[PDB]
Amino acid sequence: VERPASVVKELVENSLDAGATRIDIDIERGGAKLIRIRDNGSGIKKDELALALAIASLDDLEAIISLGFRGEALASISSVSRLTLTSRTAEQQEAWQAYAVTVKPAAHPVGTTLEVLDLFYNTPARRKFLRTEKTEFNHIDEIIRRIALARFDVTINLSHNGKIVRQYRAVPEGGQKERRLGAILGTAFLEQALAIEWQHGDLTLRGWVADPNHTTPALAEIQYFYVNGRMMRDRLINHAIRQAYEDKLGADQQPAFVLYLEIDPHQVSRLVHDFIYQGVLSVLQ
Amino acid sequence: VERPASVVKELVENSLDAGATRIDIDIERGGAKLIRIRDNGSGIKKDELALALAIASLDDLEAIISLGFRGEALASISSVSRLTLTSRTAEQQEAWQAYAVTVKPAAHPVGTTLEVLDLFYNTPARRKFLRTEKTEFNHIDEIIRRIALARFDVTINLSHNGKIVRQYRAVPEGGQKERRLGAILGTAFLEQALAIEWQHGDLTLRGWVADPNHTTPALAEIQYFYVNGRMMRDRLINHAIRQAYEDKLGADQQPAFVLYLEIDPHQVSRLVHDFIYQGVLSVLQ
Amino acid sequence: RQDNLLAAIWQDSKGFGYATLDISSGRFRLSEPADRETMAAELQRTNPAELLYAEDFAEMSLIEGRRGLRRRPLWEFEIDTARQQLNLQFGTRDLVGFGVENAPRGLSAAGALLQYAKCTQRTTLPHIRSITMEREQDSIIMDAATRRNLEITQNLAGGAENTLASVLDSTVTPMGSRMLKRWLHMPVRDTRVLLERQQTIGALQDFTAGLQPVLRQVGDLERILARLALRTARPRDLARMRHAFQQLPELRAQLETVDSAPVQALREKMGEFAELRDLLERAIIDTPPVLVRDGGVIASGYNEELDEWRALADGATDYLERLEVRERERTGLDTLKVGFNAVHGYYIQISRGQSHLAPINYMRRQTLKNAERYIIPELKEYEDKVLTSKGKALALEKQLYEELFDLLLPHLEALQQSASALAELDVLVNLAERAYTLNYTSPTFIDKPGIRITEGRHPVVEQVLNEPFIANPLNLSPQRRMLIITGPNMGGKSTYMRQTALIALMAYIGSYVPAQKVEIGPIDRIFTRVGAFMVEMTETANILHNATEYSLVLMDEIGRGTSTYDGLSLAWAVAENLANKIKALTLFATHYFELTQLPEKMEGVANVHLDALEHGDTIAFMHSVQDGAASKSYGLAVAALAGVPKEVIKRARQKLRELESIS
Amino acid sequence: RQDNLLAAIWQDSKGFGYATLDISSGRFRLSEPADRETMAAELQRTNPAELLYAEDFAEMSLIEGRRGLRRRPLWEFEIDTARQQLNLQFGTRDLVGFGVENAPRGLSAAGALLQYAKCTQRTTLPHIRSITMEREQDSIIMDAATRRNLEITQNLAGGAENTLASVLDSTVTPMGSRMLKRWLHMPVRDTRVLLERQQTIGALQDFTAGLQPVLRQVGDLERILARLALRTARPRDLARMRHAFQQLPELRAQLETVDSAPVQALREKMGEFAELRDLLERAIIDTPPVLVRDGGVIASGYNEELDEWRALADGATDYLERLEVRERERTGLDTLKVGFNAVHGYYIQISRGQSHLAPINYMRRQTLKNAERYIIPELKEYEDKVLTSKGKALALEKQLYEELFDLLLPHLEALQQSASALAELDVLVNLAERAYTLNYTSPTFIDKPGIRITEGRHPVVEQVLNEPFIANPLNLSPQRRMLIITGPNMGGKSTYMRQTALIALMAYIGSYVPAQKVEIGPIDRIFTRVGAFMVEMTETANILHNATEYSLVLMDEIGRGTSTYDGLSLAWAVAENLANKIKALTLFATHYFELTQLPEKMEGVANVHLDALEHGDTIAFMHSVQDGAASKSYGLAVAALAGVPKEVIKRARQKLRELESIS
Numbered sequence A, B: 001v002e003r004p005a006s007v008v009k010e011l012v013e014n015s016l017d018a019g020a021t022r023i024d025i026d027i028e029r030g031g032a033k034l035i036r037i038r039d040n041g042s043g044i045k046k047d048e049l050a051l052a053l054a055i056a057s058l059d060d061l062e063a064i065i066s067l068g069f070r071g072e073a074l075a076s077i078s079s080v081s082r083l084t085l086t087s088r089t090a091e092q093q094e095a096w097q098a099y100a101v102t103v104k105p106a107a108h109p110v111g112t113t114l115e116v117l118d119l120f121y122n123t124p125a126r127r128k129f130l131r132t133e134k135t136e137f138n139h140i141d142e143i144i145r146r147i148a149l150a151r152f153d154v155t156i157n158l159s160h161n162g163k164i165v166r167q168y169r170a171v172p173e174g175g176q177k178e179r180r181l182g183a184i185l186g187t188a189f190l191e192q193a194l195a196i197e198w199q200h201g202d203l204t205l206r207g208w209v210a211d212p213n214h215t216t217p218a219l220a221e222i223q224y225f226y227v228n229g230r231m232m233r234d235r236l237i238n239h240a241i242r243q244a245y246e247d248k249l250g251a252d253q254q255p256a257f258v259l260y261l262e263i264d265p266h267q268v269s270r271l272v273h274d275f276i277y278q279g280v281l282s283v284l285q
Numbered sequence C, D: 001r002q003d004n005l006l007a008a009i010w011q012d013s014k015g016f017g018y019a020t021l022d023i024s025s026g027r028f029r030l031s032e033p034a035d036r037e038t039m040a041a042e043l044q045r046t047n048p049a050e051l052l053y054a055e056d057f058a059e060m061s062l063i064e065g066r067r068g069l070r071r072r073p074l075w076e077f078e079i080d081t082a083r084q085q086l087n088l089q090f091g092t093r094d095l096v097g098f099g100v101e102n103a104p105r106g107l108s109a110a111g112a113l114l115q116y117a118k119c120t121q122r123t124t125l126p127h128i129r130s131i132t133m134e135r136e137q138d139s140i141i142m143d144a145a146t147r148r149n150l151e152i153t154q155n156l157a158g159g160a161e162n163t164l165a166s167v168l169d170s171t172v173t174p175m176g177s178r179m180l181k182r183w184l185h186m187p188v189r190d191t192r193v194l195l196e197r198q199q200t201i202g203a204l205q206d207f208t209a210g211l212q213p214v215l216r217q218v219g220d221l222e223r224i225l226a227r228l229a230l231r232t233a234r235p236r237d238l239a240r241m242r243h244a245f246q247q248l249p250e251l252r253a254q255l256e257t258v259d260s261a262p263v264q265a266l267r268e269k270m271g272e273f274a275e276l277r278d279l280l281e282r283a284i285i286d287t288p289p290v291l292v293r294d295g296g297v298i299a300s301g302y303n304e305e306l307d308e309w310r311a312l313a314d315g316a317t318d319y320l321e322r323l324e325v326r327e328r329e330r331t332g333l334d335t336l337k338v339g340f341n342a343v344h345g346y347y348i349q350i351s352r353g354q355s356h357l358a359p360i361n362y363m364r365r366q367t368l369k370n371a372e373r374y375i376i377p378e379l380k381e382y383e384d385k386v387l388t389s390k391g392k393a394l395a396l397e398k399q400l401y402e403e404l405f406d407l408l409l410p411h412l413e414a415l416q417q418s419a420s421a422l423a424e425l426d427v428l429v430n431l432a433e434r435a436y437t438l439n440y441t442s443p444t445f446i447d448k449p450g451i452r453i454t455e456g457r458h459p460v461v462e463q464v465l466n467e468p469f470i471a472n473p474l475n476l477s478p479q480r481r482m483l484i485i486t487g488p489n490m491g492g493k494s495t496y497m498r499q500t501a502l503i504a505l506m507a508y509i510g511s512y513v514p515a516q517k518v519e520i521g522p523i524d525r526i527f528t529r530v531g532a533f534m535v536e537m538t539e540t541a542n543i544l545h546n547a548t549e550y551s552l553v554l555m556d557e558i559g560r561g562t563s564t565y566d567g568l569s570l571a572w573a574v575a576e577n578l579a580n581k582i583k584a585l586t587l588f589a590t591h592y593f594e595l596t597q598l599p600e601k602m603e604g605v606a607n608v609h610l611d612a613l614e615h616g617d618t619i620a621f622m623h624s625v626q627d628g629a630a631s632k633s634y635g636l637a638v639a640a641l642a643g644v645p646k647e648v649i650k651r652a653r654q655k656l657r658e659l660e661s662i663s
Ligand SMILES: Nc1ncnc2c1ncn2[C@@H]1O[C@H](COP(=O)(O)OP(=O)(O)NP(=O)(O)O)[C@@H](O)[C@H]1O
Pocket: C533, C534, C535, D468, D469, D470, D471, D472, D488, D489, D490, D491, D492, D493, D494, D495, D496, D623
């Protein structure tokens, strides 16, 4: 957990893993000063709070640690911060809260909220690994943009220094996907976005691609492809895509695309290349 | 009581007759809108209030009207106004107050205060006759200036439409009388004021006279002479004064003077003139 | 079936003061008709049988024909006489409690009316114990208290910081911000005007992104129009203004797609003025200076003569240089400079050391510290032509500028309304943006006085709050018109009260509201009395004297007496009057627990409270509204939160224990 | 015999933040030394055994030599980290109650100090429960509350109306009004400075009349000096300024007679600057215009060349006329006019009908609708010389003006202080006038904290009040240091409280006071908390945390809980703390009658009250202070006065009767 963005990766995954449909995020000063992720999914009980931070004390708890995959990630984070937790489960209950050394009740909706203050308190170096506040937030905005595209069904609201930055609304059952796409990637891509939908049996290719004739260097930074919702970047897939732009028009310039490959679980398969190459080439013609 | 100045004459005499040492006066709009005289002398009891406004009603009172020569002046004034009285006697008591139709208690220092709202309240004409505002107040300022000179031992504070106008301090036991003289008559007279003190037996002449060589037409308006505190104006006394200016310097211009004659009461006497003529002539030479 | 009334009337420079009375009923009323038309309409409406008028009444045409005419003297209409006399009858010293303190034109009319009645009756009239004004504006209401208390545009200390306006006013131009401020001080009742704005907010919600960038480019058009009427507008005023016109083609294009009749009407009122746009593009250089005195405003080609004069002046740059080089190389003196001075004019400067090596032709102009300056005939001739041409070029530039006003003022009428349209658009676009961004919903109106909120929140606090703001439901009607709010301090009483007032105003300006769903009826007047005793009692009376079934009333912990008993005694009798007689919609927050018996006995009353839970070394405010009353007094808990040492706290708890175990 | 203390330090742009601690005692302190000298003096004073400093600490010379030096990283001095961490220990969410909220420079130092102590101890330190700042000026301080509450220069709503300043500030010039405002926000403790002002007020009381008329003629000299430093002063600034110098001879004459060393020192600091006076009288015309651009500023004779250029220009008026007459009579054409135009220059105009009768020599210049304008060589030559001479005359006028700054700026030092002297005089003369006019007396000082008033009055209210203001005696000392004030509302509690605070400030600016006689001891801090609950408790704590024996405290009806018991329970425990531990001088106004048991049990405490008398359906307030307690609660009397209907009043009386006959 070197950057703030890697700590955000972890806690944002934990919230979505609890079935969260609204993940509202408030940051200050590149994530150094304050970070707040709140999820309205399933919460944690009064028993599972205190021990998820703090080791022969496990003697009389009796395997509650098991229900806390996320509870593991906390321990690595909370030992090196002034972590301030608060949460409430769905069932008849009042919200609870831990500190610093003293746990006590609080008020919170059905879900979980976390607060992190100013890290490194004994390291001369790991602090001196600060970059910039503005640039750290640009990597947060990057990783949020990555995970935003991977999950269209979750409302993500992002703010920084009070100032609200982004507002991704959630997709309902089979909803209008255009409004989310333009909000994540701005005006430039949405106007030249050409849809692609390809399928031979188990292989399925869903997504969007910019028109090669009207693509600029600014548009070319948007290059993401997903394998069952997890973002991959392999050089054989890049080949299928760039060769397809090359053969339609002579201008072999950096393409702009957002693609989802959906297959059966294996580590990845030659038809994979041919399926992708023919998918994009058909849409351009 | 045609003018406001004549109503002031009456109530101001009544306050001084009660042994008042501070008479504070607040006016608004030439005396039409508001007039307030407060005296801190002897007050009137709760018994002597009600019947002093409202005459076979004297039937069950038992001769309290005797203590109320002032009580008579009220009746003439209050029948033709919205008179608002309040007062308290010297011994342990609460102040009392009458209106309009309803008499009740109040809070006031040892003394008497009176409030008058545009005296005439049933006459359409007699109010409408009442002349200007600025000019009425100039006759008030005049009559105040007359009575101010007659009593140096009484503090008189005068205000109008919020604006505080004049502030005559009372003379303590054998005090500096210069501060009062300048405040009443301005800087002009005080600088040229020559003192006069003359006496043959019963006759006593006290006061001040301006130096004839440096007297202007503005100074010449100050022409007052008193007979045992009461201001008189006879042609024989004017003769003694002006003949004295004539014989000293050839410039026979209007004199500026403030003089007090003190004698035994008889209604009218040639030594009166010679005593006065020689008194002033001696001071100039 | 119609009234046998008495009336009194007068006029000053500004308008008319009017008063009416029914001596058989004790109903005593007042008004201030602003114009001659409303005055003529009010006379017809009331139908007085006798009329008192001032002898200085100018417009005799309003009254000549009316029955029961009585000419009155001027002295009777005195303002302060009226004040004293009315105070004498009601037994007050001031009239703040009657809600007519700020209406002296009406008060003078009542003062004269009063004197007449007394003299005609010559009987006491205790059946007349009050007065109320007949208010022209049926649309909109707010007393002094509410305007400041809610902090719409002004926080209570005096500034503009962290108000309602501060959060919602993310507009892009000053005139839009100003129009917003006027509409917030003016919520309208006409359901149809509100439906313009609701449809519009719904139709524009998608197009927020594309339009606001373009709106910013306008600048402060509204205030520039003031300076055009005065003949004082500046070149940089025109720079932005010109730039604003160039966006109107683009704006006309984007607005055409918005399906809304209010929008299409505004898009036409907007315009582009292609003719006046072209004029400024040709007549002025692309980036002008601040003032007209400096010149360099007018672009060349537009005027032939301006170019000519500039040619004489622009024949400077090339001419001066040729002389400098020729003279420097001729003499062999390297410190030879051709420079300019405002007092002495152009010159040839030579340094002190080289001064004695100058040519004979050089006439000395100016002697200095480090140098001697000279003049020659060639330079002196050219000096005169340049200064005179510059003078004439600059004088012409000032003349042409003034003549531009003459030709533009003919369109002044259409341009003022173009600016009013643009200000309205910035307001409404900002609103469509705030409704989407801050998660609001579309409300509906109803027949009867009543409010039903689903998941209502406080619009400013919920965003500025760095914790979960707990949304709360509200259910009110004519059958549920009064709520007894018990609970702890910092429980969220005032917040849940004030969020209701803010929510209501948003609905009556046509905006979407922070809730899942909202229904709301007609509301005639909004009243407020929040803790800062003279202060308290007079304002409560005012609310009592003027309220009706439609009235919204927000009481924040009133009923403090000069002791414990008397204050509560009042609060009980007060709520009775509001619930039983007036039947107004009321929220009554308080700490006196005994009031919670009312819901059993008074119909249309129920107990609610802000719930709190005590345990361990602390307390947890749920911030949720519940049916029922508070558990206890939480004063000892609140004092520790403010910052009090334990010495005092511990003494208080021990002492409280003694007092509670007396009985 | 030396204390073994810990300290922490750092610096930003503005100054230095400092903190000190004794871990054996639990005493925790803060400070903000403003400059290098005070900083070096504070280090010496405290004598720390160990010192934490920031790695960006620039002026290392202050700390290099001190013992126990520890270099700290920057991140430890974070302001909001300090806020959160301090809040965690004390168990608060904010630090308003500790009175260090607006001292972030100090707070950052404590935040770093805090983290070190925890690491060294590795034990809880509950013996440290608080913090207080060491405030530099031992001459006095006022909190936020008192400044606004008393309405010194600002009424509570926000304006300047009917304040203390409004009654006392009848000064004649703006800079005196401004200096007055600074001195009211700054009452001084040094006995000697107050005695300057007392002798002065006594010595000048007669001469009020002769001096204020002369002071008015000065104008705003102070702000003109700012614009002289910036090189932006205007001609009418100099007009008043010059007029101000002409009064200094007269002022020097009148002040010589005043027997007072402070006065004679000021009379010297004043000066007259006879040399600079003569300069402006000769250099500028008697009545100048507003700006420099117009010209007509510099007077003739002062400059030979300026006169020369004006002769060419002033040769206009007589020259133009001669040509007009000659040409009109020569041709026999009566419509022949000589006029001027800014664009085309001078011309000879002839009407349309006569145009064909013009001479041969006339060259046509400008053609118009109803006339033709011509030009001749004689007029065209003269045209160029006039415009160029005007330009040079005006350009010379602008140069001479700029050169006047160069010659005046060398006296700038003495002139700034001359202006400071004159501002002080307007303040003091105004004060000598107010003391005489409003009937004030000379007070005296004492050793120990105590106040003894004879016939004390409220200085603003007594004059604005349209009735007799009842003066009241006050007797306070270390043996009588707390008064329990019971009584009715509008009895005069807050007034008699606030008159005491206003009276005290007048004494500590050196002024005479509205009373027959006054004695007063030293006062270190003045504290206030008046009703507008979170609001209330935090502020009371601050007063508790920071008070001493010398402190003035004015509580106005605090101790409102979330019910009846809890609020009183606090008020009791509060007064105990003040009376027993702090021993401060206190006035405790309230409505809870049970407090009146304290004087029996607590030494230095006694009962007082505002007395009132009840009868029928009304009440009479005597407004006089009495020993003892109130008769009853008078809330029922007060409510009627506000304007409440009898329905409510009757219910309250019936109900009150039940409650009073329980017990
Ligand atoms: N010494 C006095 N002389 C004359 N009138 C006075 C005097 N003291 C007070 N009053 C009047 O009494 C009223 C009450 O003053 P105040 O002390 O504010 O009452 P309170 O008990 O503090 N209640 P509140 O005004 O509600 O805060 C004021 O309106 C004054 O006009």
